[PDB]
Structure formats: structure tokens, C-alpha cells
Amino acid sequence: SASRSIQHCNIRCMNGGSCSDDHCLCQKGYIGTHCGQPVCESGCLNGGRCVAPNRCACTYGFTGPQCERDYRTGPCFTVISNQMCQGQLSGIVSTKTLCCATVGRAWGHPCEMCPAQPHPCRRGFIPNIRTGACQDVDECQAIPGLCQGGNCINTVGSFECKCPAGHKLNEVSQKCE
Ligand SMILES: [Ca+2]
Numbered sequence: 001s002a003s004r005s006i007q008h009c010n011i012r013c014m015n016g017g018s019c020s021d022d023h024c025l026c027q028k029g030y031i032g033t034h035c036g037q038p039v040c041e042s043g044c045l046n047g048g049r050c051v052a053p054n055r056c057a058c059t060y061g062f063t064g065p066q067c068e069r070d071y072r073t074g075p076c077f078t079v080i081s082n083q084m085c086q087g088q089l090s091g092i093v094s095t096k097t098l099c100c101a102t103v104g105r106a107w108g109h110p111c112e113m114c115p116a117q118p119h120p121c122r123r124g125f126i127p128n129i130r131t132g133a134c135q136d137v138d139e140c141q142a143i144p145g146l147c148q149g150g151n152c153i154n155t156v157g158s159f160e161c162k163c164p165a166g167h168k169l170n171e172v173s174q175k176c177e
Contacts, residue, residue: 029053
């Protein structure tokens with residue numbers, strides 16, 4: 001006894017799909033004929049791409065597997081006219097948010113310039129994406145080495161730089177001189 005007849009489906013199944021009847025019986029959260037399209041439940045973000053059910057693949061710089069944490073890495077620029085973005089450069093990675101709310105200069109590429117305090121709280125604060133509460137940043141820690149002097153300490157609303165004697169903190173260029 002022999003037969004060339006296919007004792008099963010005809011189409012092709014991938015992605016946890018059962019190949020029966022004529023169409024693929026898709027894995028949970030998969031759609032399409034061969035079930036190769038995953039359900040982008042909460043919507044893709046940052047121009048990503050759906051790879052699994054609700055698993056969108058996220059481009060760069062979003063923490064949390066649902067990329068709604070749009071923290072891109074960028075150089076924090078400290079002084080901008082049409083002339084320079086700072087003038088001595090710096091691989092200070094922080095968020096634009098940080099650089100705008102606190103320090104109030106610019107950040108990113110190519111040179112994204114912003115006012116200081118954006119939200120009506122206090123420049124040294126960022127509205128918690130959880131509570132909504134304006135929280136002070138350890139600007140010292142949150143804007144890597146922005147203070148060029150001796151010590152850098154933090155109060156809410158502003159950081160405190162400790163300068164050697166004779167020196168004088170200049171918050172225009174966070175410089176003790
Ligand atoms: Ca602070």
C-alpha cells in the first residue's frame with residue numbers, strides 16, 4: 001500500500017502554528033496565513049518592529065521591553081549659538097531631559113538646544129514618569145562630570161560644587177576658578 005496523497009495540510013506553518021484544515025492555527029498572539037505576524041498589542045514604539053506577541057523590538061535607548069522610555073544617548077552640549085555646541089566637547093551621556101531641565105543648555109545629535117526648566121516645577125527636577133512628582137536630580141551624577149572644580153554635592157533644585165580656596169564656582173560653565 002502506497003500513496004502520493006498528502007495525509008495532512010498543504011500550506012506551511014511557522015511560529016507555533018498548527019497546520020490543519022487549510023490555514024495555519026496560529027500560536028497565541030500570532031496572525032496571518034502561516035502565522036508569521038505577531039500581535040503588536042500595546043503598539044510598537046520608537047519606530048521598532050513587532051517580533052513576538054506584544055514584543056516589539058526596540059530601536060535604541062529605551063529601557064523597558066515596551067520602549068516608552070525614550071532616553072536616547074547623546075552628548076550634552078553646554079553653550080550654543082550658531083557658532084559652537086560647547087567648544088571642548090564631552091562624552092557626557094545624560095538625557096536631553098536632564099540637560100534641559102537642569103544645566104539648561106543642549107543635548108544630542110546634531111546639537112539639540114533647549115531652554116532650562118521645561119515643566120513648572122524646579123529646574124533641578126524632572127517629573128517622575130511614575131508618580132508625576134518633580135524630583136531633584138543628583139545633577140552631579142546625572143550629568144557626568146559637568147562640574148569642573150573639586151567636590152559636587154546635591155541639593156534639590158540645584159547641585160552644590162565645592163571649590164578650592166580662591167576659586168569661585170561659575171554656574172555658567174560649572175567652573176571653580
Ligand atoms: Ca539636584
